[PDB]
UniProtKB/Swiss-Prot annotation:
Involved in the nuclear export of mRNA species bearing retroviral constitutive transport elements (CTE) and in the export of mRNA from the nucleus to the cytoplasm (TAP/NFX1 pathway). The NXF1-NXT1 heterodimer is involved in the export of HSP70 mRNA in conjunction with ALYREF/THOC4 and THOC5 components of the TREX complex. ALYREF/THOC4-bound mRNA is thought to be transferred to the NXF1-NXT1 heterodimer for export. Heterodimer (via NTF2 domain) with NXT1. The formation of NXF1-NXT1 heterodimers is required for the NXF1-mediated nuclear mRNA export. Forms a complex with RANBP2/NUP358, NXT1 and RANGAP1. Associates with the exon junction complex (EJC) and with the transcription/export (TREX) complex. Found in a mRNA complex with UPF3A and UPF3B. Found in a post-splicing complex with RBM8A, UPF1, UPF2, UPF3A, UPF3B and RNPS1. (Microbial infection) Interacts with Saimiriine herpesvirus 2 TIP protein. It comes from Homo sapiens (Human). It is found in: Nucleus; Nucleus, Nucleoplasm; Nucleus speckle; Nucleus, Nuclear pore complex. It comes from the Eukaryota. The minimal CTE binding domain consists of an RNP-type RNA binding domain (RBD) and leucine-rich repeats. The nucleoporin binding domain consists of a NTF2 domain (also called NTF2-like domain) and a TAP-C domain (also called UBA-like domain). It has 2 nucleoporin-FG-repeats binding sites (one in the NTF2 and the other in the TAP-C domain) which contribute to nucleoporin association and act synergistically to export cellular mRNAs. The gene is NXF1. Belongs to the NXF family. Expressed ubiquitously. Residues 15-69 form the TAP-C domain. This is Nuclear RNA export factor 1.
Length: 69
């Protein structure tokens, strides 16, 4: 029993990522890397994420590198 010998941590994400990220890239034009962050703040909802992303495409700060440079 100690800080090291206690519990058993594990990854937070799963295949869910690629299950979405792919269909999320073409969601509103996002790439295959910036779309993930969108699906990470919303918890991979796929709708509420890409929905807040689209509004940010012309409001927040979406580097062109995403859509297509």
């Amino acid at each position: 029993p100690a800080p090291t010998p206690s519990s058993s941590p594990v990854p937070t994400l799963s295949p869910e990522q690629q299950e979405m990220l792919q269909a999320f890239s073409t969601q509103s034009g996002m790439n295959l890397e910036w779309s993930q962050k969108c699906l990470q703040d919303n918890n991979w909802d796929y709708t509420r994420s890409a929905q807040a992303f689209t509004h940010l495409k012309a409001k927040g700060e979406i580097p062109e590198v995403a859509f297509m440079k």
